[PDB]
Design an enzyme around this catalytic site. Structure first.
Site, PDB file in Angstrom:
ATOM      1  N   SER A 100     -10.336   9.943  -4.066  1.00  0.00           N
ATOM      2  CA  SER A 100     -10.903  10.901  -3.123  1.00  0.00           C
ATOM      3  C   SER A 100     -11.155  12.180  -3.933  1.00  0.00           C
ATOM      4  O   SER A 100     -10.247  12.691  -4.566  1.00  0.00           O
ATOM      5  CB  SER A 100      -9.957  11.162  -1.952  1.00  0.00           C
ATOM      6  OG  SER A 100     -10.390  12.260  -1.163  1.00  0.00           O
ATOM      7  N   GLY A 101     -12.398  12.647  -3.942  1.00  0.00           N
ATOM      8  CA  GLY A 101     -12.772  13.803  -4.732  1.00  0.00           C
ATOM      9  C   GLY A 101     -12.055  15.069  -4.296  1.00  0.00           C
ATOM     10  O   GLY A 101     -11.402  15.728  -5.107  1.00  0.00           O
ATOM     11  N   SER A 102     -12.176  15.412  -3.014  1.00  0.00           N
ATOM     12  CA  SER A 102     -11.566  16.652  -2.504  1.00  0.00           C
ATOM     13  C   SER A 102     -10.048  16.624  -2.730  1.00  0.00           C
ATOM     14  O   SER A 102      -9.433  17.625  -3.132  1.00  0.00           O
ATOM     15  CB  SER A 102     -11.914  16.856  -1.030  1.00  0.00           C
ATOM     16  OG  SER A 102     -11.304  15.858  -0.195  1.00  0.00           O
ATOM     17  N   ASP A 262     -15.784  14.750   7.054  1.00  0.00           N
ATOM     18  CA  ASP A 262     -15.261  15.467   5.887  1.00  0.00           C
ATOM     19  C   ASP A 262     -15.795  16.910   5.947  1.00  0.00           C
ATOM     20  O   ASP A 262     -16.998  17.123   6.183  1.00  0.00           O
ATOM     21  CB  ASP A 262     -15.737  14.726   4.618  1.00  0.00           C
ATOM     22  CG  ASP A 262     -15.160  15.286   3.291  1.00  0.00           C
ATOM     23  OD1 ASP A 262     -14.442  16.316   3.237  1.00  0.00           O
ATOM     24  OD2 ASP A 262     -15.481  14.656   2.263  1.00  0.00           O
ATOM     25  N   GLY A 267     -16.476  14.076  -2.555  1.00  0.00           N
ATOM     26  CA  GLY A 267     -16.689  13.808  -3.968  1.00  0.00           C
ATOM     27  C   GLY A 267     -17.036  12.349  -4.239  1.00  0.00           C
ATOM     28  O   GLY A 267     -17.923  12.046  -5.046  1.00  0.00           O
ATOM     29  N   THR A 268     -16.331  11.436  -3.583  1.00  0.00           N
ATOM     30  CA  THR A 268     -16.673  10.023  -3.708  1.00  0.00           C
ATOM     31  C   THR A 268     -18.041   9.725  -3.108  1.00  0.00           C
ATOM     32  O   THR A 268     -18.737   8.816  -3.566  1.00  0.00           O
ATOM     33  CB  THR A 268     -15.598   9.085  -3.057  1.00  0.00           C
ATOM     34  OG1 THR A 268     -15.432   9.394  -1.671  1.00  0.00           O
ATOM     35  CG2 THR A 268     -14.274   9.206  -3.765  1.00  0.00           C
TER      36      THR A 268
HETATM   37  O1  LIG Z   1     -13.928  14.030  -1.475  1.00  0.00           O
HETATM   38  C1  LIG Z   1     -13.748  12.836  -1.106  1.00  0.00           C
HETATM   39  O2  LIG Z   1     -14.087  11.874  -1.845  1.00  0.00           O
HETATM   40  C2  LIG Z   1     -13.143  12.607   0.226  1.00  0.00           C
HETATM   41  C3  LIG Z   1     -12.874  11.380   0.851  1.00  0.00           C
HETATM   42  C4  LIG Z   1     -12.308  11.679   2.079  1.00  0.00           C
HETATM   43  C5  LIG Z   1     -12.239  13.055   2.182  1.00  0.00           C
HETATM   44  N1  LIG Z   1     -12.736  13.612   1.059  1.00  0.00           N
END
Ligand SMILES: O=C([O-])c1ccc[nH]1
Ligand SMILES: O=C([O-])c1ccc[nH]1
EC number: 4.2.1.77
Lengths: 352, 338
Positions: A100-102, A262, A267-268
């Site tokens: 998960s990016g965040s 989100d 990020g993903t």
């Molecule tokens: O940033 C992300 O990949 C992500 C996945 C769920 C919440 N943020």
């Protein structure tokens, strides 16, 4: 972290988990720094499977009265992979994903701001391990704070381009499926009647649940090197990319089960979208891509390099964003509390 | 700049308590101070909004009391209101005050007087092993404003309802035949139905408290099932819909107070007789009428609400000056829209 070491004798019988509160570009990613032993398992992936199947920690930290459906919580564990300095397991409301990016940005920020790993300025380099693989992090640090995190995410790739998808009430949609560290069905919002304004959040989340359900039924998901990840986690609803003052930029709303958009650009999600774009020759190595969220927060992204995963063309994307500490807490469980695993009710934790 | 919070829930309903880092608001009464909190919004938004709070939280600010009878004051911050009283929150406040040492603990019983924005309440806490285990609250004067009034509600025809005050204001309606069971997985449907009934009640019936003109709307819809007796004790379940659309996880102390006022007006319960209020998750408040009084021209009661609270954690909330969301945000996916 500029926090006091508080102690109350009347609370001495409570089990205690130490948490740093954080969000990255609006998306919560709390970080457990103490009170929880590494799960059993030889690999980080296996440890994360334990977290997902056992559920005890997940329910304690994610359910009301301590969590809420808007939280994600990350458990720091020792690294298994020799390359890494720290491992982490991501707990989302209804899933325990490869990446998960965040949340990786929250993890990086908490780790450095609290001194768990030492901070160099102006740049700190570190290697972290997520269940879905190692990630390389460069944190831009100043005045004792990690201000911006650059994450070289795991290999991302397209699994289906322009597939047909039947969804009740919407006829036939044309969608992509892709992997960006987590799995996506990607669809254009404009055709669905949405422009991705914040007042649409509930409708988009519910629409997203329905589209993701259809995609799991009709298309499924396969990661050539991870037989354990066989479902689509997210529906990414996009508006078309544009070029703003020279820079490619696009907005999306990603629906997280059981029904939350989100707050970050995902990020993903940007990783997956970049994989589709590269496959269609819409962007090349190095070019900046600014992903935006439903609340107009931003991740600056680019493709670092190209690679291959089980014979599929793949990319290594960089996701960059900022995180902010919101607090520090000690979560407690009184042995006489009648809800040791919290509870879920459909008014504040969407059903189904 | 760091806000110290003790996390608590009373019979399931969150009632966090700010114990440090926040100076009392300006005002010469606790009501004036609560009006500052409501109009200024800075503290409310910071502690209630994501990313720190959530629509399921309430947060209470301790302040020195203005009423000379009281030892400690508190201001209750609910998701869409800053009201006169809340039973579950007063229980969390009492528990945090005693467990933290802010007021000294006697065992087996501690007696203290607190001040809520709607008036003084008397508390008896049952304490053992250094913890306040059960809180008994003599709530503010509670009374009926309308018995069996007609209320037109879209989709439902005409309902017969009561309006009453139990430290906050209620439209009270029988859930039987409204087509929902009072069950956790009906929570969303009940919350939405409740918002709709409350809106209708505000338009057609309104609410006036004789002592304070600011308490001038109906806050809650209390959907009940009929009184039964369980283990020999009179008992009743309700689901109270809290704006902008959440069912109280506790039995609602102000709702029990208002229901007791109706019951008493109808000769269904006497002074001192135990009544157990139950919530959507089957938690309980043990209640009784302590005495009778008069508020303006209205007959009223002084009800006792009793419940247990538990500490969920201790936290220190912080704000980075570069954080782009210093007051958080509200989105309709997780914070129901008006
Ligand atoms: O940033 C992300 O990949 C992500 C996945 C769920 C919440 N943020
Ligand atoms: O117990 C109460 O009175 C209450 C009001 C709102 C939530 N709980």
């Amino acid at each position: 972290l500029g926090t006091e070491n508080l102690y109350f004798q009347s609370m001495r019988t409570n089990k205690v988990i130490h948490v740093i509160g954080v969000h990255a570009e609006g998306e919560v990613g709390d970080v457990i720094v103490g009170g929880v032993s590494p799960p059993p398992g030889d690999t980080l992936w296996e440890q994360s499977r334990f977290i997902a199947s056992d559920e005890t920690l997940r329910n304690f930290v994610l359910n009301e009265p301590r969590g809420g459906v808007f939280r994600h919580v990350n458990l720091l564990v020792p690294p298994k992979d020799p390359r890494a300095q720290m491992g982490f397991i991501i707990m989302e409301p209804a899933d325990t994903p490869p990446m998960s990016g965040s949340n990786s940005i929250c993890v990086s920020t908490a780790i450095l701001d609290s001194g768990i790993i030492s901070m160099q300025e102006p740049l700190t380099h570190m290697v972290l391990e997520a269940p879905g693989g190692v990630i390389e992090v460069t944190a831009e640090c100043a005045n004792g704070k990690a201000e911006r995190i650059n994450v070289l995410n795991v290999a991302s790739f397209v699994t289906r381009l322009a597939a047909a998808l039947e969804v009740e009430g919407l006829g036939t949609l044309t969608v992509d499926t892709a992997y960006g560290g987590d799995s996506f069905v990607i669809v254009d919002a404009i055709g669905l009647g949405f422009s991705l304004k914040p007042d649409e959040a509930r409708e988009l989340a519910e629409l997203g649940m329905k589209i993701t359900a259809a995609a799991n039924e009709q298309l499924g998901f396969v990661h050539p090197c991870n037989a354990d990840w066989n479902h689509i986690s997210f529906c990414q609803m996009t508006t078309p990319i544009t070029r703003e003052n020279g820079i490619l930029t696009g907005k999306s709303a990603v629906a997280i089960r059981p029904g939350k958009i989100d707050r970050s650009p995902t990020g993903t999600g940007c990783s997956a979208r970049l994989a589709v774009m590269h496959a269609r020759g819409e962007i090349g190595i190095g070019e900046t891509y600014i992903g935006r969220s439903i609340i107009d927060s931003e991740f600056k992204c680019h493709i670092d390099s190209l690679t291959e995963i089980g014979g599929l063309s793949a990319i290594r994307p960089v996701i960059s964003g900022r995180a902010w500490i919101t607090g520090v807490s000690q979560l407690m469980l009184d042995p006489t509390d009648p809800w040791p695993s919290g509870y879920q009710l459909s008014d504040t934790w969407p059903a189904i």
